Amino acid sequence: SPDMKLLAGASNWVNQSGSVAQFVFTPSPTQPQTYEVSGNYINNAQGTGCKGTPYPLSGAYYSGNQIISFSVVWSNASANCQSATGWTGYFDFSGSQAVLKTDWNLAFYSGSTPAIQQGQDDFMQSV
């Protein structure tokens, strides 16, 4: 119900750093109420690499309670930051406008040492 618009066409969602996730949803052929997530992510966070160009995203979405999980590998023709982020969370449709609330993990290397850093991103729709 509350995701009727979300599931039609592409939409742009902007987080606190100004980065933009563009999502498209396609129904799963076998998983009830589930969708494949496609689209692109543009990182606009100052003080990072891989800024200002689209990176494909992919994941999965559950319509029954509007939960999502999606990932980006930070490699494209413009810039390679040799790392990957996974976001998992939920669309909160309870307020005056929708907010996508996520926790993320960033896997990366610092020298020869692997690391996984956690954080949180909240996105609001740009319409």
Partner: peptide
């Protein structure tokens, strides 16, 4: 000719 950074957080 992609620009390479050590990680997303280290330009």
């Amino acid at each position: 000719v992609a620009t390479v950074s050590e990680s997303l957080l280290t330009e």
